[PDB]
Amino acid sequence: QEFAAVDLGSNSFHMVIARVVDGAMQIIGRLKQRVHLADGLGPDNMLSEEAMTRGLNCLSLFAERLQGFSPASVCIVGTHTLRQALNATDFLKRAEKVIPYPIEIISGNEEARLIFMGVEHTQPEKGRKLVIDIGGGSTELVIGENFEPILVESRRMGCVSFAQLYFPGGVINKENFQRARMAAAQKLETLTWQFRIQGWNVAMGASGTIKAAHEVLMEMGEKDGIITPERLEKLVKEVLRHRNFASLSLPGLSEERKTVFVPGLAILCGVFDALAIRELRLSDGALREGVLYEMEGRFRHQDVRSRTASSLANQYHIDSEQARRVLDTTMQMYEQWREQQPKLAHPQLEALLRWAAMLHEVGLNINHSGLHRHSAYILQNSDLPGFNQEQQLMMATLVRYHRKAIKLDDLPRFTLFKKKQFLPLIQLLRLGVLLNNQRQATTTPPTLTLITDDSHWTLRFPHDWFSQNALVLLDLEKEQEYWEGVAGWRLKIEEE
Template identity: 50%
Template structure:
């Protein structure tokens, strides 16, 4: 283990002794959101989420004066949040106001009325601070490493950030949001080619000066966050691609469908929440402008954004290089996983996986092998419930917990591998994935099952000096070769391999060993 990894593990180990409940509240232009979470075992555990649509931006007039009606809606929502926060100290509550409160010339009146029902300080942050906090939220929750472009389309503003790992390089916030654009370009919910193009061109005008600088910096991945991009992702996932990847062609397809109707109330798409139609249409215009100005090829949705960035900012020690490692360490502590056994099993899985080369999707090989290693480290997480049926308990935990650092397909794959690491394996057990090849998934399952078998004796396990894995041309038949005398000295492993070989015959695949 290198010094950096050791430092991060020591840091997270220290955190497990400090249980702390925290809250983050985002006073957005469209909705107010609150997350209540607990810092425990070196990880963030979300306890509750509250959201209320207040449409603050609708109350901002041409002179940037916030109406009393809008103030009242916001204050009433904060009174509700205050009920949930009883007993919280001020240092554990982070509240920020964004675009609308930033712009309102009478925001002091909002703060005065809010103070009567809400006993926590409200910090109205700058656009650049908002952008950097959004970037932190994405980085702390998503698996992508290296340079990335992050885009967040909110109710009143859009943030665009390019950064390396946790460090933003450029961060900008521009005054264009789905609520403000809805009232300006889609009055009374009317849709037309003309008003859509007006909204699109306005968005282009607001960000085209950023285009060259951002494109010159470049990126390896593009992530989008918050409501508009989430909604576009959900519609694409329901109609075009289960992964919900946003591409230029898919975006144009949604725009074409949108322009077939003449009013918000007439727009009916699978995956589109009717309550979000009023912000979906102007959001499409803004998103199209972002794609065009920055020459984006594809974008993945991130469920981490401003609120997550606020939460993680309360505990600086969470900034580790590998988000998955932090997540796994938290699970290890929370569920008291045998770390030595996890290390042994992961070592065996790694040894075997590096000898397998016949991947159906070679470009995903490293990603799949990484998920395999995390499955090898976490397959016993369900033992805390019951050893009987442990694989089902483990899979349920991993499928239903929030796992920062794993996207949804990776989380589904992780849970499947853990569920099938032991017991009878049937072809009907294999789940369909949008991203992964079915045969590759079967390969991962077989590799994990072998790694578990090789370490059944736990601390009494004899680590073989060499294992050779060979496969036939179709990769269905595998051959394992151990050093001389190893299987004679380990009859339990020999018997487990024999049973595995018998069971695999029903799948039409073979396993021989010597």
């Protein structure tokens, strides 16, 4: 089978096609289209119509090229430009009409991890590594070893945004360059000590700027194209004997690359200044390759998100047995709800529901009062390896609404998930948590039957059950009240 990773970048949209052959993975096709989506990002962080049109037109072409690919065989990621864009969801809703695969925006830190995995997968040598990626919009810096990140950082600096800030009108001079160079180092001052102390056997660079630096050095007689401080000084002096981005006649520089090379190079010097890098080698794997290997992993049921959840539970020292009893109650009802609406019950949302139940009390060391809000704050704002933005927000949202009054209009507006899919998950978690209010004093009902008709639910308990569990009935009657304020929800409680 073939599968595809699409990457919606600042300057280009890329597609990579691979297959797994003899247990080994093989790159089979690469294509890109220059979309220049970042060029359309306004000072109010709105993507212009014309940038959106360019993106949408390209996706229209990619959809045709991907005909016959099942959605499981395709992953589309958005990065900096789509994280910054205040109208990102509008772009994504429009894209739903031209391409039948969801666009998953990912955080800078998750982007950084995937770049690091791309580098790890395409290099035979092991050891501790620094990985640098200067892109159009952001820069990623990872120290890691043997497929395990140790330090992961992302900064809002890139070739495109720096062109606009430090080189207006494309004007090149040593004052414009030095300001860009210092600014890049300025952005790194809070991480420099931590990174330099960690160390690395070798530094690997990825993507456009570093590839351009490497090509130019090779056209300067530096056969290996390895970036060092001295050779970087030779690059800067050369670019300084030019005057504008338009007249930037460098050997090994394409016309497209000429437009952002200078601010990219200045960021690269900033990195070298701040981190005191001796030697930077070009990697032939980055984000796209990271995504491909992440997709193969999940085909073989290897999902880092499980580890992310366990680590988070341990970090906050939650009561794992309370988490377990809530999970068990919630899942017993989930199974009944699923049997009655199987085409609403997708395994991706189910996972999020399980982690929600597992993590619903992470905020307990903040406060037991308002716990549902504190846990949601932690979950919404933490760095969670393996999650995309929407999954992370959705899990946070399930936790946010597991107690107190429920206001449907306050819900985020997901593009990956439909209300008809996730609203019952809020209902199940709420009931699951409620039933376990007494914690280790809880009496678990021997039987519990859930009958759904849309969002009209009835829960059937054993005969005379409530005669000896009067507080649970009070709790259920409070929840009935809460559902009376939710359009379409009704809860009926019965005994067998």
